[PDB]
Enzyme design. Structure first.
Site, PDB file in Angstrom:
ATOM      1  CG  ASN A 115      -6.334 -24.019 -56.967  1.00 51.48           C
ATOM      2  OD1 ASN A 115      -7.178 -23.131 -57.129  1.00 51.48           O
ATOM      3  ND2 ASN A 115      -6.471 -24.984 -56.051  1.00 51.48           N
TER       4      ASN A 115
ATOM      5  CG  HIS B 131     -19.593 -25.884 -62.048  1.00 54.93           C
ATOM      6  ND1 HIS B 131     -19.575 -26.352 -60.749  1.00 54.93           N
ATOM      7  CD2 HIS B 131     -19.985 -26.927 -62.818  1.00 54.93           C
ATOM      8  CE1 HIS B 131     -19.932 -27.624 -60.737  1.00 54.93           C
ATOM      9  NE2 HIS B 131     -20.190 -27.997 -61.980  1.00 54.93           N
TER      10      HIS B 131
ATOM     11  CG  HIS C  83     -10.953 -20.271 -54.431  1.00 58.72           C
ATOM     12  ND1 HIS C  83      -9.762 -20.116 -55.106  1.00 58.72           N
ATOM     13  CD2 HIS C  83     -11.059 -21.592 -54.150  1.00 58.72           C
ATOM     14  CE1 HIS C  83      -9.158 -21.289 -55.206  1.00 58.72           C
ATOM     15  NE2 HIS C  83      -9.925 -22.201 -54.633  1.00 58.72           N
TER      16      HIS C  83
HETATM   17  C1  HDD Z   1     -16.496 -30.855 -53.907  1.00 61.40           C
HETATM   18  C2  HDD Z   1     -16.068 -29.677 -53.458  1.00 61.40           C
HETATM   19  C3  HDD Z   1     -14.930 -28.999 -54.121  1.00 61.40           C
HETATM   20  C4  HDD Z   1     -13.700 -29.559 -54.418  1.00 61.40           C
HETATM   21  C5  HDD Z   1     -13.196 -30.966 -54.209  1.00 61.40           C
HETATM   22  C6  HDD Z   1     -12.982 -28.431 -55.055  1.00 61.40           C
HETATM   23  N1  HDD Z   1     -13.677 -27.279 -55.092  1.00 61.40           N
HETATM   24 FE1  HDD Z   1     -13.172 -25.430 -55.907  1.00 61.40          FE
HETATM   25  N2  HDD Z   1     -14.838 -24.666 -55.308  1.00 61.40           N
HETATM   26  C7  HDD Z   1     -15.892 -25.328 -54.764  1.00 61.40           C
HETATM   27  C8  HDD Z   1     -15.926 -26.633 -54.408  1.00 61.40           C
HETATM   28  C9  HDD Z   1     -14.871 -27.583 -54.552  1.00 61.40           C
HETATM   29  C10 HDD Z   1     -17.128 -24.443 -54.571  1.00 61.40           C
HETATM   30  C11 HDD Z   1     -17.641 -24.535 -53.139  1.00 61.40           C
HETATM   31  O1  HDD Z   1     -18.177 -24.866 -55.467  1.00 61.40           O
HETATM   32  C12 HDD Z   1     -16.642 -23.068 -54.994  1.00 61.40           C
HETATM   33  C13 HDD Z   1     -16.860 -22.024 -53.890  1.00 61.40           C
HETATM   34  C14 HDD Z   1     -18.015 -21.142 -54.339  1.00 61.40           C
HETATM   35  C15 HDD Z   1     -18.096 -21.444 -55.799  1.00 61.40           C
HETATM   36  O2  HDD Z   1     -18.701 -20.758 -56.618  1.00 61.40           O
HETATM   37  O3  HDD Z   1     -17.413 -22.557 -56.106  1.00 61.40           O
HETATM   38  C16 HDD Z   1     -15.195 -23.321 -55.415  1.00 61.40           C
HETATM   39  C17 HDD Z   1     -14.388 -22.327 -55.858  1.00 61.40           C
HETATM   40  C18 HDD Z   1     -13.162 -22.465 -56.580  1.00 61.40           C
HETATM   41  C19 HDD Z   1     -12.471 -21.354 -57.282  1.00 61.40           C
HETATM   42  C20 HDD Z   1     -12.871 -19.900 -57.348  1.00 61.40           C
HETATM   43  C21 HDD Z   1     -13.640 -19.575 -58.616  1.00 61.40           C
HETATM   44  C22 HDD Z   1     -14.012 -18.119 -58.579  1.00 61.40           C
HETATM   45  O4  HDD Z   1     -13.099 -17.283 -58.766  1.00 61.40           O
HETATM   46  O5  HDD Z   1     -15.192 -17.829 -58.312  1.00 61.40           O
HETATM   47  C23 HDD Z   1     -11.367 -21.949 -57.816  1.00 61.40           C
HETATM   48  C24 HDD Z   1     -10.292 -21.309 -58.638  1.00 61.40           C
HETATM   49  C25 HDD Z   1     -11.419 -23.376 -57.444  1.00 61.40           C
HETATM   50  N3  HDD Z   1     -12.489 -23.638 -56.681  1.00 61.40           N
HETATM   51  C26 HDD Z   1     -10.474 -24.357 -57.846  1.00 61.40           C
HETATM   52  C27 HDD Z   1     -10.424 -25.750 -57.367  1.00 61.40           C
HETATM   53  C28 HDD Z   1      -9.352 -26.621 -57.697  1.00 61.40           C
HETATM   54  C29 HDD Z   1      -8.163 -26.274 -58.559  1.00 61.40           C
HETATM   55  C30 HDD Z   1      -9.667 -27.800 -57.043  1.00 61.40           C
HETATM   56  C31 HDD Z   1      -8.899 -29.081 -57.005  1.00 61.40           C
HETATM   57  C32 HDD Z   1      -8.376 -29.572 -58.107  1.00 61.40           C
HETATM   58  C33 HDD Z   1     -10.954 -27.543 -56.370  1.00 61.40           C
HETATM   59  N4  HDD Z   1     -11.380 -26.278 -56.578  1.00 61.40           N
HETATM   60  C34 HDD Z   1     -11.675 -28.535 -55.556  1.00 61.40           C
END
Ligand code: HDD
Ligand code: HDD
Ligand code: HDD
Lengths: 726, 726, 308, 83
Positions: A174, A365, A101
């Site tokens: 999402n 988060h 993202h």
């Molecule tokens: C275990 C790892 C992991 C898993 C399984 C998911 N995500 Fe995630 N997501 C992250 C690890 C992550 C992250 C790496 O922690 C991020 C990237 C950098 C951050 O700040 O958070 C992130 C970013 C992130 C953002 C952007 C937030 C922003 O605007 O800064 C959104 C909207 C989502 N995720 C949504 C989801 C949804 C709807 C998931 C499934 C239901 C999902 N993520 C599964």
């Protein structure tokens, strides 16, 4: 003074339509738009006007044009501290982008519930219809870098930071109701497969490559969200015209300790609307910032994005009443079985001041919940809770990321945590531990209770052995992809076929294409056959004999899964291209602009050059852009008024403007001699549905055009566009 | 509620003597001590009383005693976000320590000039005797880590941050008037040589090892500052009883553009005073925090450290009128040649609230000057200017270190710099560049002028080729060490000899000892012979024929270079140990405390146990510490009142207390039967200078004692204690 | 050139008693002492003798005594990349110290089982008495910074990294058989209480202050390890003369899947021995590096520390 | 220092010289090279002053700047010839 005497460098601090004025930081464009979060940021907002240019230490700079050197043609001196401070800051501007993202656009706003929800949750921000909660919302793609394009084919993120009086609640969702995978342990595998491939870092912002479809073909759990990505859901028209979902089943906890399962929904008040693939792909080239720009300009115009928060609610005793597992994030809960109950409204009404400081540095988060909410054992959510805290240590430079202004709670926060890089808060507490006597144990724990109580986890029962083991109830992969497919209109189904077909044609290893088609045959054989024929693949007798999956609890279709089966588009905030000539018929333009204004539809006047043209009555018309500078991709409909049509009849750019709009199914209206353009789009003399025509732009002309716009695109035109060379 | 019923857990918010009450953050101890900088920190100060314990996101915590687990004897759950946030912050508390001067102690205060200096400098903070400038001062050692000991033999740092109306000015000095090396290119070589050796990281806080004296023997430019470090200058009694020096020649620039060369001086109003080596070394064991503690308690007692800022001023036309080069940082300017002219006074009157937030994160840099000051070509200063900006990028995590609260200017600061890790300021300027029209070029450059003008460098002539070459005028290394040596008292000379002898005895490679003695023979043969004798080295005939270096511009001595030659003692803020017994004569104690209070001297009541004893008049005396808990190392003099002396007369710690105090040349006073202790220190029946005695602690008794304390130590006792078994 | 002609600058590459010769890097003092891990480090080891002084990019330096200036008494020039590279590297030498156990001393060695333990564990490094496993061991205090003193009163850490054929096994223990607290959630509270107090950052290397004993008085679970800390266990004579414990009950798993509970122990071949307090405290002043020095010189003398 | 995480970026493999490099620089984040030099400073006697400076020369010599003439006042000023 370098600004023009007439003051034209400065936009007006009032709502203005897209393109009318230069865009501006939100505090300058809309100074009167306030909320508690925006007010709390005032301590860190920096002005500029009437201030002297200084170093970061406050020393006034006399000459910001030159390095200090030994003679005016000599070497630069190490003692130039002004140069080195300025270049040092420049040299360290960039921070790591988000792992996923990374591309996103954000705005300020507020949320209000319709009614107290005290009967089902003790969450304070849902306790009173008069309680307003400030929000910060970031929309995003998933795959591409921060510099990638907006209108790619991808899942979109929809992240909301609620600054409640009992702590920050981040709803991190999402634009589809399920995710690709079941267990968080596989997230790096899935993300590595969709991301640019590791030897050469290609392709950006696209799932159309070998490693993605390799993983999909070997992990049928991915097929449900793949179906959504291949539909027009994957190419929304605007962040304002898509849905949002929390995906996971969470819990609501009330004051008496009763838990209700809940899934979160956002429904756009502007309705659901998407592009078509050829348009979206070309638009990543003509304007890679289209969604960022459209969001910012809608807010500057007063077309505030609005979304209704809604809850699907399932009592604890109903956990096992469905054909699927509630805790499986590759499964959706059909609205026909569990309706979305309306909860409140969110309005996004002010842009940031500084993209980097507020958007890029924001940290969302899903582990950030408040009393009244809790988690479930959803094994994707469970692993998410680890990641969003961990990743900020590198991305935002350490554990004090909550002190970055945009991330700060507006409610009180006090504890015994100390130090860490860029520590801002200066603690005066004699104690940095508890239990302590030297500060009479302050700050103190708070027992749980109905309001303003401490957080306590719902005491759900845990039984089993320590195992790395998938739940057998999760082992079903085809019935929800089928439900989605069979819920779509025939033209949505065509676009899904063409999505799969286009993407698999970019897969270099043919056996991967064949294995995906085989997976499709387990979902629906009409889909599989249609994709296979575009790939030159013949299904085998055994493939044609694969039994389809059953209905989902009796459902073959759920209407809520289609973008368009029941059109719900507001025309307000949409935009119409008006193709000018050098002596426009003013009576036409009057009728056109009269009707657009009455519906809140914006217009951009286009021509072959910039500057002005004069209408037949002497009115001077300012030109917003050229035909090539603002292509039909960027608008919802095209109108050609009458006038000196010979001026543009032979213009290749003007003719192509209509052909591109025609191909992409957009309404087109032609007044008077402008009806000569029907030949270019191969429309017969008798006319056709979706082409508005008359001797002049009158009352009936514009009603017909706006009725077409209300239906978004002219789907009945699809059989004609394959013969159009555009 | 865990506090004691009598509410006695909190110190009073009033000046109290050292050890009377628990120490406290400065805002709690002295809330009515304010200045503009302290006031501006109120936006980031955090309280604690009457607040709930929360996460960093503001969520109230119910149970801060337990992890979340599956059963109360089960495994810990990944979903415990309260635990993981708390441990994450703990896990990332530490930041890199300073490369040098990592060990340091700091305080707030203010500066005020005596009179306008606008005839010689246009610097705003020196322009008006009624102009009050807040300061933040950090004192330090050089070699040891942040957790090393205070009273080591080392150079001390003395850094002052001036929060002026025209920018931050950092005066970053040491407590000797020269540095070890001439060119900044050698700084990593010198620092690596004095630091712990790279194979085993030994020794901490000590120059007494092979690699330091190897470098010294091969780089005679170091010999001058080595002389100072081997004198008692290297072991100050207090940061309040040492001088400060900017070392480098800088420039003052007035409004008419005239440049005056200047060297900066701090003179302690508490006088110059140092420990002796055996006392300093043992004190690094009994209390490694002695200097940090003593500074903090002096401020809590109202004994605010005061320093007079002074200038050595040299006209531009006198640059070459000395035997040495003014830009050579291994050369001092004798006060006999250029007197120090008083400029103003600095008072340190409040401790910080949080050590890490305010002390550890403070960033000083000598390139931080303001209009009215400028640099010179001093090649050590020249390279410093690069280092202090560069090093903060790792130490403080990025280029926004000026936004850390303690580092923020109190005057305005605005420019076109943007982003960087943990960016706090949210810029509203439409432009992030200049020249710009879209914000009418704000913030704007300011022409230089007599007041509030922009910074412009003094346009000094530069002429020569691009060379890596030491100026030949720097190539003399022995005259200034000799001048320092000849300026010391005989007992200060003895302590220098003992410093070299002790340190070189810890050099394992004998040839290194021999090469250093050879360098000493080029400075003064008396010194060389005395050190050689302590090392079992015999000087050769050639060494005994080495011609002494010439005098410095005819000077045979300069008494300002001695700690003690010209008396400047001041007993206010010193501390006396009073050794109690279980039935003290209240008349003695009454007369003692009365006399100390009239001179601002504090007392520590010591005994063989804690708790209380009762005097002969019923007064209950609380005990501050035991004999072994607060040894004589920590006090300036010892008084033993009369009473039941039999109680302590056979106490071994009490007897050794006097022997240690005696060995370290401290005044001792014995009243009545306490004169039996004269046997322990072998004092004659008729008495001796440095020992106060009488039938009772009358008023003459206390006048003799306080006169001794004003002379700091009893130097005449040295031959007696050279044979003391203690 | 600058070395003395008699060669007395260089210690002998053979065992010598403490103080007899200058100490040296291990590869130069004992070039023939090898194990698999020490050999595997030869790819990153850098020599020095007979090589040219260069920048980090490999450019030979002609004059390492001077900055580049406009005239030999002029201003330093920004184009001096040799100066800036040298000072930049120096400027960024330090990294964060460990949150706890920041003060520590370490050495290389090896481990060998007495007999096969296949009956109770399938761990490869315990499979038979001919499994030779290289180790790296770091001993430490707990409270003080990396520049604090060795012979403080404190718990000692005893951390062993086993480089096994089936992965790294770290046995991260202390020199007493229990810890102060029961639940990890309290670790920042206990550590903040024993560490220097937050207003003035005093005292270093000492539990002897108000906030530690405040916590202790309110948390009786701490009393057992407090008893050990207040005993002479808290002031060992040497890292060679203390015990080590893993503290926690762990599990051994054999090839048939059976689990046995286990607690780990290290027993010092040099016996148990501690200082007395007056000696330990004064020694933090006379030699704050005593334990680090003693460990290094024992190894250089061939008095190899041994633990069962 | 921020992009590659510290001053040892020359130890990242793609950035490494293929020729020898030796000096007295030490430590920094993710330090890969393990220095065996007894000395980390020069001049030193304890390693006979190695690694040593090299005079400039026709081949394999040390770097020395071209001794071009500098003449002027310390100014923040654009050369008129650039205008
Ligand atoms: C275990 C790892 C992991 C898993 C399984 C998911 N995500 Fe995630 N997501 C992250 C690890 C992550 C992250 C790496 O922690 C991020 C990237 C950098 C951050 O700040 O958070 C992130 C970013 C992130 C953002 C952007 C937030 C922003 O605007 O800064 C959104 C909207 C989502 N995720 C949504 C989801 C949804 C709807 C998931 C499934 C239901 C999902 N993520 C599964
Ligand atoms: C070119 C390298 C260099 C040279 C030649 C010097 N210094 Fe330095 N000094 C630094 C590089 C440095 C540094 C690495 O930049 C430090 C360490 C961390 C920091 O922030 O600055 C520092 C810290 C530092 C401090 C501690 C400031 C504080 O409390 O944070 C003082 C008092 C001095 N220095 C004083 C001097 C004096 C009086 C010098 C000789 C005139 C001197 N330094 C030469
Ligand atoms: C949840 C936090 C936590 C808890 C409850 C403990 N520790 Fe720990 N320990 C750490 C968190 C930590 C750490 C912060 O992760 C350290 C500091 C830096 C590092 O790398 O690990 C560490 C360092 C560390 C070291 C130094 C290793 C080295 O030489 O680098 C030792 C020997 C121990 N610990 C031993 C223990 C023992 C015997 C404990 C009780 C059974 C214990 N720790 C509890």
């Amino acid at each position: 003074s370098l600004a023009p005497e007439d003051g034209s460098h400065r936009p007006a601090a009032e709502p203005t339509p897209p393109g009318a004025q230069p865009t501006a930081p939100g505090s300058l464009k809309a100074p009167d738009t306030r909320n508690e979060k925006l007010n709390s940021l005032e301590d860190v907002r920096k002005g500029s006007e009437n201030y002297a240019l200084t170093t970061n230490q406050g020393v006034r700079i006399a000459d910001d044009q030159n390095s200090l050197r030994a003679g005016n043609r000599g070497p630069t001196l190490l003692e130039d501290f002004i140069l080195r401070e300025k270049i040092t800051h420049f040299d360290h501007e960039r921070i790591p982008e988000r792992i996923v993202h990374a591309r996103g656009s954000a705005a300020h706003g507020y949320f209000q519930p319709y009614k107290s929800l005290s009967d089902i949750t003790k969450a304070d921000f849902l306790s009173d219809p008069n309680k307003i909660t400030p929000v910060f919302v970031r929309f995003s793609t998933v795959q591409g870098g921060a510099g990638s394009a907006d209108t790619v084919r991808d899942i979109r993120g929809f992240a909301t930071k609620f600054y409640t009086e009992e702590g920050i609640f981040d709803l991190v969702g999402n634009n589809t109701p399920i995710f690709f995978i079941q267990d968080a342990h596989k997230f790096p595998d899935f993300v590595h497969a969709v991301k640019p491939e590791p030897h050469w870092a290609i392709p950006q912002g696209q799932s159309a490559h070998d490693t993605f479809w390799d993983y999909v073909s070997l992990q049928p759990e991915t097929l449900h969200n793949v179906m959504w990505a291949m539909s027009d859901r994957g190419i929304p028209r605007s962040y304002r015209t898509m849905e949002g979902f929390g995906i996971h089943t969470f819990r609501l906890i009330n004051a008496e300790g009763k838990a209700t399962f809940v899934r979160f929904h956002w429904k756009p008040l502007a309705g659901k609307a998407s592009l078509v693939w050829d348009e979206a792909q070309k638009l990543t080239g003509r304007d890679p910032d289209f969604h960022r720009r459209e969001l910012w300009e809608a807010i500057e115009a007063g077309d505030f994005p609005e979304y209704e928060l809604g809850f699907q609610l399932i009592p604890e005793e109903d956990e096992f009443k469905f054909d699927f597992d509630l805790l499986d994030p590759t499964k959706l809960i059909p609205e026909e079985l569990v309706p979305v109950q309306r909860v409140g409204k969110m309005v996004l009404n002010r842009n940031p001041d500084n993209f980097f400081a507020e958007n890029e540095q924001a940290a969302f988060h899903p582990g950030h919940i408040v009393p009244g909410l809790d988690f479930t054992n959803d094994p994707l959510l469970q692993g998410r809770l680890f990641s969003y805290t961990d990743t900020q240590i590198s991305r935002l430079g350490g554990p004090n990321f909550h002190e970055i202004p945009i991330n700060r709670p507006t409610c009180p926060y006090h504890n015994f945590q100390r130090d860490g890089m860029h520590r801002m808060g200066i603690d005066t507490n004699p104690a940095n531990y508890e239990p302590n006597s030297i500060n009479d144990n302050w700050p103190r724990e708070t027992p749980p209770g109905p309001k303003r109580g401490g957080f306590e986890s719902y005491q759900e029962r845990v039984e089993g052995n320590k195992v790395r083991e998938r739940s057998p109830s999760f082992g079903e992969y085809y019935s929800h992809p089928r439900l989605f497919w069979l819920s779509q209109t025939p033209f949505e189904q065509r676009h899904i076929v063409d999505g799969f077909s286009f993407e698999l044609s970019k897969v270099v290893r043919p056996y991967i294409r064949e294995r995906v088609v085989d997976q499709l045959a387990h979902i629906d054989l009409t889909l599989a056959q249609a994709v296979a024929k575009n790939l030159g693949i013949e299904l085998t007798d055994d493939q044609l004999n694969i039994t389809p999956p059953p209905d989902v609890n009796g459902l073959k279709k759920d209407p809520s899964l289609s973008l368009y089966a029941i059109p719900d588009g507001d025309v307000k905030g949409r935009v119409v291209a008006i193709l000018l000539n050098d002596e426009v018929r003013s009576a036409d333009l009057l009728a056109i602009l009269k009707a657009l204004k009455a519906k809140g539809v914006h217009a951009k006047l286009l021509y072959s050059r910039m500057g002005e043209v004069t209408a037949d009555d002497g009115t001077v018309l300012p030109i917003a852009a050229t035909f090539a500078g603002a292509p039909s991709l960027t608008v919802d409909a095209v109108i050609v008024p009458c006038g000196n049509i010979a001026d543009i009849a032979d213009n290749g750019d003007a003719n192509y403007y209509l052909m591109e709009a025609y191909k992409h199914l957009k309404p087109i209206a032609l007044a008077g001699d402008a009806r000569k353009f029907k030949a270019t789009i191969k429309i017969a003399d008798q006319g056709e549905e979706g082409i508005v025509e008359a001797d002049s732009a009158d009352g009936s002309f514009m009603d017909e055009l706006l009725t077409l716009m209300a239906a978004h695109r002219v789907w009945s035109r699809i059989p004609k566009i394959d013969k159009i060379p555009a």
